[PDB]
Symmetry: C2
């Protein structure tokens, strides 16, 4: 599976985006993971949901609307384990995205852009990928 | 050329480390480049010279000594061009590392660890690589 990974999607309440992968280096060297829900296939399109894991440290979430980054949302929750494969499950709810790590919800991000605007997901930074699945 | 790229090295005053590559995404999405001069082959070994480019934004330099990150050094110099292949040339001088971008020096980092302690270089984050050459 190629990284950066870019896929066309369509999402609504009830959708899940499942991502399975492995960080490329040890947590001590601070690998990152970034998942961006874009409004168009173009890479510089707006981002309804930006989810960036600083492995072993913190998580940052935001949106990019009309080319401008908005209010940052940080989390200290860090369920990811050094050297381990992770399974990310991003649930689309009516009010928010909910990010599950290995089956439990650890991050939440209220919708700022309607989820019907999402047309693309890009997964990138310091991971290998074995699975990217949108429910249907 | 595989990324993350890890090579055994030996460096002294007069050495140059040349790195040619290309960012994996457009500058608007803030790709990174990280070059770490390590004291051992192990990834979690100390770092005599940590050089991290936030493409289109800034550069951060530091050292990691006895597993602890030291004083950060930032630069606003940004000679890198969006979408373009870059040629990084890291000159080892008696007093410092000097980072050249496409033939001109834009960053400098005084030695905190003796350069004879460097045994490994790792190049990683959001780039493809076509060249990694240590002068000899």
């Amino acid at each position: 599976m190629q990284v950066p990974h870019t896929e066309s999607v369509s999402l609504s309440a009830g959708s899940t985006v499942t991502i399975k992968g492995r960080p490329l280096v040890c947590f001590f060297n601070e690998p990152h993971l970034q998942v961006d829900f874009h409004t168009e296939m173009k890479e510089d399109s707006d981002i309804a949901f930006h989810f960036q894991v600083y492995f072993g440290n913190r998580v940052v979430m935001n949106s990019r609307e009309f080319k401008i980054w908005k209010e940052e949302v940080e989390s200290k929750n860090m369920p990811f384990q050094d050297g381990q494969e992770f399974e990310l499950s991003i649930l689309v709810l009516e009010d928010k995205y909910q990010v599950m790590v290995n089956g439990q919800a650890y991050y939440n991000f209220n919708h700022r852009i309607p989820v019907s605007s999402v047309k693309m997901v890009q997964v990138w930074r310091d991971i290998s990928l074995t699975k990217f699945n949108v429910s249907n």
